[PDB]
Amino acid sequence: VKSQQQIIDSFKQANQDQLFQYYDSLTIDQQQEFIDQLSTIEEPAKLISTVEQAIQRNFTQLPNEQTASTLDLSKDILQNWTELGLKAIGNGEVAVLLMAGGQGTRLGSSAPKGCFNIELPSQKSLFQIQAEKILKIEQLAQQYLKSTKKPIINWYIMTSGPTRNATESFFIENNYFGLNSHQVIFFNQGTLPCFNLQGNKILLELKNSICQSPDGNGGLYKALKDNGILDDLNSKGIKHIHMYCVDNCLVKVADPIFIGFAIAKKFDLATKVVRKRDANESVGLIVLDQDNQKPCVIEYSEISQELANKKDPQDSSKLFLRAANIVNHYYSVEFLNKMIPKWISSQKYLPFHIAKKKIPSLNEFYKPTEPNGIKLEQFIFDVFPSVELNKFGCLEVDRLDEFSPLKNADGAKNDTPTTCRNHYLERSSKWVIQNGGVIDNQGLVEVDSKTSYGGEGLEFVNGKHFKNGDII
Ligand SMILES: CC(=O)N[C@H]1[C@@H](OP(=O)(O)O)O[C@H](CO)[C@@H](O)[C@@H]1O
Ligand SMILES: [Mg+2]
């Protein structure tokens, strides 16, 4: 490590003299704490350079050979992928990577987003729904293979540094929701300094502290390496990884169909999409970059308003680019072993993305009105074009069964606790009604994962009646 003076010199040489405006009026402990914080920043000179650089497109649809759809495949082909997936789960070759993010502040909660309660009749948090989803599929895999005990699906949860304790305590308080305490593994995501609007000066949060924020889901790769997560994957002999975001309340965790799909096709990388809701839906789009003939994702905050509304040449009723990204990825561990060192070393695969933000910080503190600074983010999918086109898979699935994100506080039209709650109940009710069950008009039921992972094993409800709010 470096001395007090050396950290100060390096930052000053990087033109961050403003970080030391009040240094001399700080107590010694405040100075030492400041230096320690500035120490966690690897290569400030580079980083400030990278940011500076980051401040200063032909797409088409994915070739047909790289796509498949759960809405079009025969039940036999889907069953075969399900079996290939349950076998991998059953052999202990499947692990899950969760991007937990940080606090559900935007939703009106200080707690981690995974603790959010969408008010289902069971009152189960997002974390609990995903945990029972995992427990359930482990049992279905055990049944398929006829094993004496259920297989284990290690669940690596990436938390932000500030939500780490509250996330782990929540799991402990709940006895891990039925999972083995050793299969829930927590690791912290990194952070990046926040900059002023011109992106040349790091912002002071306090007179002895800089503004920092989670470095985006794209920072998952470096966090994996640094926290020994990739090491663990090798030590446990894991071959397949399913990665998703905690805000999707309908998420099929460790979905065997998605894994079977990658296995059947021998893909290094694969991703899930659903038909775009509307031209303005804030959703990334999976396309083929015609320039380099590589798959990629165009984020909603960076796509041309012209491309977003472009109609499809072979059909005027459809949007040309309509394969919406639902942050649901598959990686083979072999691919991660080969590519992670590459992805984390050069900005070519993980360029920084700039987002203007209202950031509470020194002018004396103050919570601003208009944007006053910038947050930096690496996007998880920026590595997609580093894959070989024929090793990439894109699986379209049904939005009604697989995607309903919690993004906004109640009040908004889309992606609120209410839309999640209703879509969740509507799916449960559809499964029940579809198996002969009868729900009393105006009623919606909730299906417990313990009962059904994704609609199977519900035949027993044939003829039975249910009342609004029953849990099945
Ligand atoms: C970098 C990233 O992962 N962006 C994702 C993510 O958007 P956010 O609103 O930034 O969380 O979720 C969307 C699905 O809700 C997906 O379409 C988009 O591509
Ligand atoms: Mg296809």
Short mmCIF file of C-alpha atoms and ligand atoms in Angstrom, two decimals:
data_model
loop_
_atom_site.label_atom_id
_atom_site.label_comp_id
_atom_site.label_asym_id
_atom_site.label_seq_id
_atom_site.Cartn_x
_atom_site.Cartn_y
_atom_site.Cartn_z
CA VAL A 1 0.00 0.00 0.00
CA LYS A 2 0.98 3.68 -0.24
CA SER A 3 1.70 6.36 2.34
CA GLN A 4 -0.58 9.30 3.15
CA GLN A 5 1.54 11.64 1.03
CA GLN A 6 1.75 9.33 -1.96
CA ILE A 7 -2.04 8.99 -2.23
CA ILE A 8 -2.35 12.77 -2.05
CA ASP A 9 0.35 13.28 -4.68
CA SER A 10 -1.15 10.80 -7.12
CA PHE A 11 -4.60 12.44 -6.92
CA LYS A 12 -3.14 15.93 -7.22
CA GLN A 13 -1.11 14.92 -10.25
CA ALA A 14 -4.45 13.66 -11.68
CA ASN A 15 -5.80 17.18 -11.28
CA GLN A 16 -8.08 16.30 -8.34
CA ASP A 17 -6.74 19.10 -6.13
CA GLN A 18 -10.35 19.95 -5.23
CA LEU A 19 -10.55 16.74 -3.17
CA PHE A 20 -8.11 18.33 -0.74
CA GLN A 21 -9.77 21.73 -0.36
CA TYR A 22 -10.60 21.09 3.30
CA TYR A 23 -8.03 18.38 4.08
CA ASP A 24 -6.02 20.56 6.45
CA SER A 25 -9.02 21.50 8.60
CA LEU A 26 -9.92 17.86 9.19
CA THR A 27 -8.99 15.98 12.33
CA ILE A 28 -6.26 13.36 11.90
CA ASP A 29 -8.75 10.52 12.05
CA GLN A 30 -10.87 12.17 9.33
CA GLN A 31 -7.76 12.58 7.17
CA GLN A 32 -6.74 8.94 7.67
CA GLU A 33 -10.25 7.75 6.82
CA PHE A 34 -10.13 9.93 3.67
CA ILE A 35 -6.81 8.51 2.58
CA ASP A 36 -8.04 4.96 3.15
CA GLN A 37 -11.09 5.67 0.99
CA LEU A 38 -8.94 7.18 -1.78
CA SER A 39 -6.71 4.09 -1.53
CA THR A 40 -9.41 1.72 -2.78
CA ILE A 41 -9.34 3.57 -6.09
CA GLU A 42 -7.03 1.62 -8.40
CA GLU A 43 -5.23 3.91 -10.87
CA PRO A 44 -6.97 7.29 -10.44
CA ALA A 45 -4.93 8.75 -13.29
CA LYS A 46 -6.16 6.00 -15.61
CA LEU A 47 -9.77 6.06 -14.36
CA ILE A 48 -10.08 9.86 -14.72
CA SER A 49 -8.53 9.40 -18.17
CA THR A 50 -10.99 6.59 -19.03
CA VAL A 51 -13.89 8.75 -17.90
CA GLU A 52 -12.60 11.70 -19.95
CA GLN A 53 -12.24 9.39 -22.96
CA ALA A 54 -15.75 7.96 -22.40
CA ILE A 55 -17.32 11.41 -22.75
CA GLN A 56 -15.77 12.25 -26.14
CA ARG A 57 -24.53 2.25 -35.72
CA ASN A 58 -26.03 -0.44 -38.00
CA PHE A 59 -28.23 -3.10 -36.42
CA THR A 60 -30.34 -5.93 -37.77
CA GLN A 61 -32.10 -8.93 -36.25
CA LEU A 62 -30.25 -11.97 -34.93
CA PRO A 63 -29.74 -14.73 -37.51
CA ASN A 64 -32.37 -17.47 -37.19
CA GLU A 65 -29.80 -20.08 -36.15
CA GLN A 66 -29.13 -18.29 -32.87
CA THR A 67 -32.78 -17.92 -31.81
CA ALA A 68 -35.44 -20.25 -30.47
CA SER A 69 -38.75 -19.58 -28.71
CA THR A 70 -40.65 -21.30 -25.93
CA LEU A 71 -43.82 -20.05 -27.59
CA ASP A 72 -43.12 -22.05 -30.76
CA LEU A 73 -41.37 -25.27 -29.71
CA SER A 74 -43.13 -28.62 -29.39
CA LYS A 75 -43.74 -29.86 -25.87
CA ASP A 76 -41.32 -32.74 -26.71
CA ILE A 77 -38.39 -30.48 -27.51
CA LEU A 78 -39.07 -28.35 -24.40
CA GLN A 79 -39.32 -31.51 -22.28
CA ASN A 80 -36.01 -32.73 -23.68
CA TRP A 81 -34.31 -29.45 -22.70
CA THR A 82 -36.02 -29.62 -19.30
CA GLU A 83 -34.48 -33.08 -18.78
CA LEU A 84 -31.02 -31.96 -19.95
CA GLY A 85 -31.36 -29.13 -17.43
CA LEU A 86 -32.64 -31.20 -14.48
CA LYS A 87 -29.81 -33.67 -15.05
CA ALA A 88 -27.19 -30.90 -14.89
CA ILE A 89 -28.87 -29.60 -11.75
CA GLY A 90 -28.99 -33.14 -10.44
CA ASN A 91 -25.28 -33.60 -11.01
CA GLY A 92 -24.37 -30.46 -9.09
CA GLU A 93 -23.18 -28.66 -12.23
CA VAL A 94 -25.51 -25.66 -11.94
CA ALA A 95 -25.02 -22.48 -9.93
CA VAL A 96 -26.96 -19.21 -9.88
CA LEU A 97 -25.56 -15.65 -9.83
CA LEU A 98 -27.96 -13.03 -8.44
CA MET A 99 -27.51 -9.26 -9.03
CA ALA A 100 -29.22 -8.08 -5.83
CA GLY A 101 -28.35 -4.45 -6.37
CA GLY A 102 -28.72 -2.18 -3.40
CA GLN A 103 -31.53 -0.59 -1.38
CA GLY A 104 -35.07 -0.34 -2.72
CA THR A 105 -34.96 3.42 -2.13
CA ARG A 106 -36.78 4.18 -5.40
CA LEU A 107 -39.55 1.82 -4.26
CA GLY A 108 -39.86 3.71 -0.98
CA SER A 109 -37.72 1.36 1.15
CA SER A 110 -34.30 1.69 2.77
CA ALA A 111 -34.00 -2.11 2.87
CA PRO A 112 -32.34 -4.18 0.10
CA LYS A 113 -34.59 -4.54 -2.96
CA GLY A 114 -34.70 -8.31 -2.50
CA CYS A 115 -36.49 -7.81 0.84
CA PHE A 116 -39.29 -5.96 -0.92
CA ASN A 117 -42.78 -7.34 -0.32
CA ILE A 118 -45.18 -6.95 -3.23
CA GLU A 119 -48.13 -7.87 -0.97
CA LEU A 120 -48.85 -11.31 -2.34
CA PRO A 121 -51.25 -13.19 -0.07
CA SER A 122 -48.18 -14.98 1.37
CA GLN A 123 -46.42 -11.67 1.97
CA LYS A 124 -43.15 -13.26 0.76
CA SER A 125 -40.23 -10.99 -0.19
CA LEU A 126 -38.51 -11.29 -3.59
CA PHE A 127 -35.58 -13.09 -1.87
CA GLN A 128 -37.96 -15.73 -0.44
CA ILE A 129 -39.79 -16.32 -3.71
CA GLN A 130 -36.44 -16.96 -5.46
CA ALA A 131 -35.20 -19.20 -2.61
CA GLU A 132 -38.31 -21.44 -2.74
CA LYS A 133 -38.02 -21.43 -6.51
CA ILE A 134 -34.51 -22.85 -6.04
CA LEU A 135 -35.61 -25.35 -3.40
CA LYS A 136 -38.40 -26.50 -5.68
CA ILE A 137 -36.29 -27.09 -8.82
CA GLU A 138 -33.70 -28.96 -6.71
CA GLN A 139 -36.51 -31.37 -5.75
CA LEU A 140 -37.77 -31.74 -9.32
CA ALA A 141 -34.18 -32.55 -10.40
CA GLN A 142 -33.90 -35.07 -7.55
CA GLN A 143 -37.18 -36.71 -8.64
CA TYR A 144 -36.08 -36.85 -12.26
CA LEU A 145 -32.79 -38.59 -11.40
CA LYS A 146 -34.33 -40.62 -8.54
CA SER A 147 -31.56 -39.55 -6.15
CA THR A 148 -31.47 -40.30 -2.43
CA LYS A 149 -30.98 -36.61 -1.54
CA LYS A 150 -31.64 -33.36 -3.39
CA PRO A 151 -28.90 -31.75 -5.45
CA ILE A 152 -27.44 -28.40 -4.41
CA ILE A 153 -27.66 -25.25 -6.46
CA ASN A 154 -25.22 -22.75 -5.02
CA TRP A 155 -26.73 -19.27 -4.96
CA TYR A 156 -24.14 -16.48 -5.18
CA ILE A 157 -25.72 -13.16 -4.27
CA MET A 158 -23.87 -10.00 -5.22
CA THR A 159 -24.80 -7.21 -2.87
CA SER A 160 -23.67 -3.59 -2.82
CA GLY A 161 -21.31 -2.81 0.08
CA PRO A 162 -24.03 -0.90 2.05
CA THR A 163 -26.75 -3.59 1.82
CA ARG A 164 -24.44 -6.48 2.63
CA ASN A 165 -25.21 -6.79 6.36
CA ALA A 166 -28.96 -6.22 6.06
CA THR A 167 -29.12 -8.83 3.30
CA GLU A 168 -27.24 -11.50 5.20
CA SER A 169 -29.11 -10.79 8.47
CA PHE A 170 -32.43 -11.07 6.60
CA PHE A 171 -31.44 -14.54 5.31
CA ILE A 172 -30.17 -15.63 8.75
CA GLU A 173 -33.29 -14.36 10.51
CA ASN A 174 -35.30 -16.42 8.02
CA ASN A 175 -33.13 -19.50 8.31
CA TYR A 176 -32.28 -19.14 4.61
CA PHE A 177 -35.88 -19.86 3.63
CA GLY A 178 -35.29 -23.62 3.71
CA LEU A 179 -31.97 -23.58 1.79
CA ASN A 180 -28.69 -24.93 3.24
CA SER A 181 -26.82 -22.06 4.89
CA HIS A 182 -23.69 -22.99 2.91
CA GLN A 183 -25.40 -22.67 -0.47
CA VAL A 184 -26.14 -18.96 -0.07
CA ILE A 185 -22.89 -17.10 -0.72
CA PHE A 186 -22.63 -13.32 -0.38
CA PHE A 187 -20.10 -11.08 -2.12
CA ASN A 188 -19.89 -7.32 -2.57
CA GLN A 189 -20.04 -5.43 -5.85
CA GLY A 190 -17.45 -2.70 -6.44
CA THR A 191 -17.95 1.06 -6.69
CA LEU A 192 -16.73 3.97 -8.83
CA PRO A 193 -16.34 7.65 -7.88
CA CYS A 194 -19.09 10.01 -8.99
CA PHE A 195 -18.02 12.98 -11.15
CA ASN A 196 -19.28 16.49 -11.88
CA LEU A 197 -21.28 17.00 -15.13
CA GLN A 198 -18.15 17.57 -17.20
CA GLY A 199 -16.77 14.29 -15.93
CA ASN A 200 -13.33 15.72 -15.08
CA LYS A 201 -13.63 16.23 -11.33
CA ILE A 202 -14.52 13.66 -8.66
CA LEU A 203 -17.25 14.96 -6.29
CA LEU A 204 -16.91 15.35 -2.56
CA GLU A 205 -19.79 13.86 -0.61
CA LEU A 206 -18.36 15.28 2.62
CA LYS A 207 -15.27 17.34 3.38
CA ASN A 208 -13.47 14.06 4.04
CA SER A 209 -15.33 11.66 1.74
CA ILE A 210 -15.85 11.29 -2.03
CA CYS A 211 -19.13 10.36 -3.73
CA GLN A 212 -19.19 6.70 -4.80
CA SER A 213 -21.78 4.31 -6.28
CA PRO A 214 -22.17 0.65 -7.37
CA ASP A 215 -20.29 0.22 -10.63
CA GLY A 216 -23.20 -1.32 -12.58
CA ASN A 217 -24.10 -4.96 -13.13
CA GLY A 218 -21.17 -5.10 -15.57
CA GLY A 219 -18.95 -4.89 -12.50
CA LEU A 220 -20.03 -8.41 -11.65
CA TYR A 221 -17.10 -9.97 -13.52
CA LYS A 222 -14.35 -8.23 -11.52
CA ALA A 223 -16.28 -8.79 -8.28
CA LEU A 224 -16.46 -12.52 -9.16
CA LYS A 225 -12.73 -12.72 -9.59
CA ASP A 226 -11.77 -10.52 -6.63
CA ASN A 227 -14.08 -12.29 -4.15
CA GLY A 228 -12.92 -15.75 -5.13
CA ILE A 229 -16.30 -16.61 -6.70
CA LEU A 230 -14.86 -17.93 -9.97
CA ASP A 231 -12.37 -19.91 -7.79
CA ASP A 232 -15.32 -21.47 -5.94
CA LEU A 233 -17.01 -22.36 -9.22
CA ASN A 234 -13.95 -24.39 -10.17
CA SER A 235 -13.56 -25.94 -6.71
CA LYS A 236 -17.19 -27.12 -6.72
CA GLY A 237 -16.98 -28.39 -10.29
CA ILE A 238 -19.76 -26.11 -11.52
CA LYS A 239 -20.23 -26.09 -15.32
CA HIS A 240 -23.34 -23.94 -15.83
CA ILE A 241 -24.30 -20.47 -14.58
CA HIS A 242 -27.70 -18.78 -14.61
CA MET A 243 -27.54 -15.08 -13.87
CA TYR A 244 -30.51 -12.78 -13.31
CA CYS A 245 -31.63 -9.59 -11.54
CA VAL A 246 -33.50 -9.72 -8.25
CA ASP A 247 -36.30 -7.36 -9.39
CA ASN A 248 -38.01 -9.89 -11.69
CA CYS A 249 -40.79 -11.33 -9.53
CA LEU A 250 -41.70 -14.04 -12.07
CA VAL A 251 -38.13 -15.26 -12.62
CA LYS A 252 -37.62 -18.99 -13.27
CA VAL A 253 -34.42 -19.40 -11.23
CA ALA A 254 -32.13 -22.14 -12.58
CA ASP A 255 -34.72 -22.76 -15.28
CA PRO A 256 -33.91 -26.21 -16.74
CA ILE A 257 -35.29 -25.31 -20.15
CA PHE A 258 -32.80 -22.43 -20.49
CA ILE A 259 -29.94 -24.60 -19.33
CA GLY A 260 -30.98 -27.53 -21.50
CA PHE A 261 -31.15 -25.14 -24.44
CA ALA A 262 -27.52 -24.05 -23.87
CA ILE A 263 -26.42 -27.64 -23.31
CA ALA A 264 -28.27 -29.01 -26.34
CA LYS A 265 -26.69 -26.35 -28.55
CA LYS A 266 -23.32 -26.26 -26.79
CA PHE A 267 -23.52 -22.48 -26.27
CA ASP A 268 -20.82 -20.55 -24.33
CA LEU A 269 -23.34 -17.77 -23.73
CA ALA A 270 -27.10 -17.33 -24.02
CA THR A 271 -29.74 -14.82 -22.99
CA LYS A 272 -33.54 -14.51 -22.57
CA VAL A 273 -35.80 -12.02 -24.32
CA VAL A 274 -39.53 -11.31 -24.60
CA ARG A 275 -41.40 -9.35 -27.29
CA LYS A 276 -40.96 -5.64 -26.62
CA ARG A 277 -44.02 -4.16 -24.82
CA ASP A 278 -44.00 -0.86 -26.73
CA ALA A 279 -41.61 1.47 -28.57
CA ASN A 280 -41.02 3.45 -25.37
CA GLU A 281 -40.52 0.52 -22.96
CA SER A 282 -37.23 1.14 -21.10
CA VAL A 283 -35.81 -2.18 -22.15
CA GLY A 284 -32.49 -3.08 -23.85
CA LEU A 285 -32.74 -4.80 -27.27
CA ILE A 286 -30.75 -7.85 -28.40
CA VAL A 287 -29.59 -7.42 -31.99
CA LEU A 288 -26.85 -8.35 -34.40
CA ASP A 289 -24.30 -5.62 -34.97
CA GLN A 290 -23.96 -5.71 -38.78
CA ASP A 291 -20.62 -3.92 -38.57
CA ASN A 292 -18.80 -6.75 -36.76
CA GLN A 293 -21.41 -9.52 -37.24
CA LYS A 294 -21.58 -9.99 -33.47
CA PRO A 295 -24.56 -10.17 -31.13
CA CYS A 296 -25.06 -7.25 -28.75
CA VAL A 297 -27.54 -5.28 -26.70
CA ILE A 298 -28.50 -1.63 -27.28
CA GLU A 299 -29.61 -0.09 -23.95
CA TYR A 300 -32.84 1.95 -23.86
CA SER A 301 -30.97 5.05 -22.75
CA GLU A 302 -28.68 5.01 -25.79
CA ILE A 303 -30.77 3.80 -28.69
CA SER A 304 -31.83 6.31 -31.34
CA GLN A 305 -35.43 7.44 -30.97
CA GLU A 306 -35.46 6.66 -34.70
CA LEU A 307 -34.35 3.07 -34.27
CA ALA A 308 -36.64 2.52 -31.27
CA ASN A 309 -39.73 3.39 -33.35
CA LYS A 310 -38.51 1.84 -36.58
CA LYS A 311 -41.15 -0.52 -37.99
CA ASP A 312 -40.21 -3.96 -39.27
CA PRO A 313 -39.65 -4.18 -43.06
CA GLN A 314 -41.31 -7.61 -43.35
CA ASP A 315 -44.25 -6.41 -41.18
CA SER A 316 -45.48 -2.83 -40.63
CA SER A 317 -47.43 -3.89 -37.52
CA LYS A 318 -44.27 -4.95 -35.65
CA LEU A 319 -41.30 -3.04 -34.29
CA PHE A 320 -38.12 -3.98 -36.17
CA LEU A 321 -36.05 -4.38 -33.02
CA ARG A 322 -38.34 -6.21 -30.60
CA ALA A 323 -36.25 -8.80 -28.69
CA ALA A 324 -36.33 -7.15 -25.28
CA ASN A 325 -33.59 -7.97 -22.80
CA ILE A 326 -34.85 -9.35 -19.48
CA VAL A 327 -31.42 -9.58 -17.79
CA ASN A 328 -31.49 -13.38 -17.87
CA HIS A 329 -28.19 -14.88 -18.95
CA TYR A 330 -26.46 -18.24 -19.25
CA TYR A 331 -22.69 -18.66 -19.15
CA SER A 332 -20.69 -21.82 -19.26
CA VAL A 333 -18.06 -21.78 -16.52
CA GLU A 334 -15.48 -22.77 -19.10
CA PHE A 335 -16.26 -19.56 -21.04
CA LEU A 336 -15.98 -17.48 -17.82
CA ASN A 337 -12.58 -19.02 -17.02
CA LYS A 338 -11.26 -18.05 -20.44
CA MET A 339 -12.94 -14.60 -20.85
CA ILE A 340 -13.07 -12.92 -17.38
CA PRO A 341 -9.38 -11.95 -17.26
CA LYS A 342 -9.90 -10.34 -20.68
CA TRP A 343 -13.13 -8.54 -19.81
CA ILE A 344 -11.85 -6.90 -16.63
CA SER A 345 -8.53 -5.67 -18.03
CA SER A 346 -9.60 -3.52 -21.02
CA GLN A 347 -12.38 -0.93 -21.42
CA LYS A 348 -13.06 -2.50 -24.81
CA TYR A 349 -15.50 -4.98 -23.30
CA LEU A 350 -16.74 -2.97 -20.33
CA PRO A 351 -16.85 0.68 -21.43
CA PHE A 352 -18.18 3.14 -18.88
CA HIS A 353 -21.72 4.42 -19.34
CA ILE A 354 -22.56 7.96 -18.20
CA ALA A 355 -25.77 8.79 -16.33
CA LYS A 356 -26.55 12.39 -15.27
CA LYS A 357 -27.76 12.33 -11.67
CA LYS A 358 -29.10 14.46 -8.81
CA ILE A 359 -26.36 13.76 -6.26
CA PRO A 360 -26.49 15.02 -2.63
CA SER A 361 -22.98 16.35 -1.89
CA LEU A 362 -20.85 19.36 -0.96
CA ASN A 363 -21.94 22.70 -2.42
CA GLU A 364 -21.78 22.36 2.96
CA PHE A 365 -24.01 19.36 2.10
CA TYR A 366 -27.18 19.69 -0.02
CA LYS A 367 -29.65 17.50 -1.97
CA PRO A 368 -29.77 19.13 -5.48
CA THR A 369 -32.79 19.80 -7.73
CA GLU A 370 -31.40 19.50 -11.25
CA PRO A 371 -28.69 16.93 -12.12
CA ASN A 372 -25.41 18.08 -10.59
CA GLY A 373 -23.11 15.17 -11.36
CA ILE A 374 -22.52 11.86 -13.08
CA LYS A 375 -22.57 8.20 -12.08
CA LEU A 376 -20.56 5.60 -13.97
CA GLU A 377 -21.79 2.15 -14.94
CA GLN A 378 -20.47 -0.93 -16.70
CA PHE A 379 -23.18 -3.06 -18.38
CA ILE A 380 -23.14 -6.86 -17.97
CA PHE A 381 -24.03 -7.45 -21.64
CA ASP A 382 -21.22 -5.32 -23.06
CA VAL A 383 -19.20 -8.52 -23.24
CA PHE A 384 -21.69 -10.22 -25.65
CA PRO A 385 -19.84 -9.28 -28.85
CA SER A 386 -16.68 -11.00 -27.52
CA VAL A 387 -18.52 -14.32 -28.01
CA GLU A 388 -18.40 -16.27 -31.26
CA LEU A 389 -21.76 -15.79 -33.04
CA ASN A 390 -22.45 -19.54 -33.34
CA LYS A 391 -21.77 -20.04 -29.64
CA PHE A 392 -24.44 -17.46 -28.70
CA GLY A 393 -28.05 -18.35 -27.99
CA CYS A 394 -31.15 -16.18 -27.69
CA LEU A 395 -34.24 -17.76 -26.12
CA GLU A 396 -37.55 -15.96 -26.44
CA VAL A 397 -39.96 -16.75 -23.63
CA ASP A 398 -43.48 -15.73 -22.60
CA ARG A 399 -43.54 -12.43 -20.68
CA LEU A 400 -46.69 -13.50 -18.80
CA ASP A 401 -44.81 -16.43 -17.25
CA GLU A 402 -41.28 -15.03 -17.03
CA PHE A 403 -40.86 -11.25 -16.76
CA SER A 404 -42.42 -8.66 -14.46
CA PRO A 405 -39.91 -6.27 -12.93
CA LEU A 406 -40.22 -4.11 -9.84
CA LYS A 407 -38.69 -0.77 -10.96
CA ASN A 408 -40.94 2.03 -9.73
CA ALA A 409 -42.77 3.00 -6.55
CA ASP A 410 -46.56 2.49 -6.57
CA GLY A 411 -48.30 5.16 -8.62
CA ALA A 412 -46.59 4.60 -11.96
CA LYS A 413 -48.28 2.83 -14.84
CA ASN A 414 -45.63 0.13 -15.24
CA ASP A 415 -43.27 -2.00 -13.20
CA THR A 416 -44.60 -1.25 -9.73
CA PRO A 417 -45.37 -3.49 -6.74
CA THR A 418 -48.90 -3.63 -8.12
CA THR A 419 -48.04 -4.74 -11.66
CA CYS A 420 -45.71 -7.39 -10.15
CA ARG A 421 -48.39 -8.49 -7.72
CA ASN A 422 -51.07 -8.76 -10.40
CA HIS A 423 -48.90 -10.48 -13.01
CA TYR A 424 -47.78 -12.92 -10.31
CA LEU A 425 -51.37 -13.69 -9.26
CA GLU A 426 -52.59 -13.81 -12.83
CA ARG A 427 -49.96 -16.42 -13.70
CA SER A 428 -50.84 -18.49 -10.60
CA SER A 429 -54.53 -18.27 -11.51
CA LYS A 430 -53.90 -19.19 -15.12
CA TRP A 431 -52.02 -22.33 -13.99
CA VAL A 432 -54.87 -23.32 -11.68
CA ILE A 433 -57.68 -22.65 -14.15
CA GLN A 434 -55.65 -24.45 -16.83
CA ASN A 435 -55.60 -27.59 -14.64
CA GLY A 436 -59.37 -27.68 -14.18
CA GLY A 437 -59.34 -25.63 -11.01
CA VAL A 438 -62.19 -23.16 -10.56
CA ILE A 439 -61.55 -19.75 -9.03
CA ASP A 440 -64.56 -17.78 -7.85
CA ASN A 441 -65.08 -14.76 -10.08
CA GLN A 442 -63.13 -11.70 -9.12
CA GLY A 443 -60.71 -14.03 -7.32
CA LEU A 444 -57.03 -14.59 -8.01
CA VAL A 445 -55.03 -17.24 -6.26
CA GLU A 446 -51.36 -17.60 -5.38
CA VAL A 447 -49.44 -20.79 -6.12
CA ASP A 448 -46.67 -21.65 -3.63
CA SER A 449 -43.41 -22.69 -5.30
CA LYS A 450 -43.39 -25.65 -2.92
CA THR A 451 -46.48 -26.75 -4.85
CA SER A 452 -45.40 -25.74 -8.35
CA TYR A 453 -42.21 -24.39 -9.84
CA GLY A 454 -43.75 -23.29 -13.12
CA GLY A 455 -47.21 -24.82 -13.43
CA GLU A 456 -46.45 -28.55 -13.27
CA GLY A 457 -47.87 -30.96 -10.69
CA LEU A 458 -51.13 -29.05 -10.40
CA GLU A 459 -53.44 -31.68 -11.88
CA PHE A 460 -54.77 -32.38 -8.37
CA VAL A 461 -56.72 -29.10 -8.56
CA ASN A 462 -59.09 -30.44 -11.24
CA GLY A 463 -62.67 -29.69 -10.27
CA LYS A 464 -61.70 -27.93 -7.02
CA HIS A 465 -63.00 -24.46 -6.18
CA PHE A 466 -60.99 -21.57 -4.70
CA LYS A 467 -61.65 -18.16 -3.20
CA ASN A 468 -59.84 -14.90 -3.82
CA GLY A 469 -56.56 -14.92 -1.95
CA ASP A 470 -56.24 -18.64 -1.38
CA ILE A 471 -52.66 -19.95 -1.40
CA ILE A 472 -52.19 -23.22 -3.26
C1 LIG B 1 -27.48 -2.67 -17.90
C2 LIG B 1 -28.73 -3.49 -17.81
O1 LIG B 1 -28.66 -4.64 -17.35
N1 LIG B 1 -29.91 -2.94 -18.25
C3 LIG B 1 -31.13 -3.78 -18.16
C4 LIG B 1 -31.99 -3.40 -16.92
O2 LIG B 1 -32.34 -2.03 -16.98
P1 LIG B 1 -32.26 -1.09 -15.72
O3 LIG B 1 -33.46 -0.26 -15.64
O4 LIG B 1 -31.10 -0.21 -15.76
O5 LIG B 1 -32.08 -1.82 -14.47
O6 LIG B 1 -33.20 -4.20 -16.95
C5 LIG B 1 -34.02 -4.12 -18.15
C6 LIG B 1 -35.15 -5.12 -17.90
O7 LIG B 1 -35.92 -4.65 -16.80
C7 LIG B 1 -33.19 -4.50 -19.41
O8 LIG B 1 -34.01 -4.38 -20.60
C8 LIG B 1 -31.94 -3.59 -19.46
O9 LIG B 1 -31.17 -3.94 -20.62
MG MG B 2 -34.35 -19.23 -34.50
#
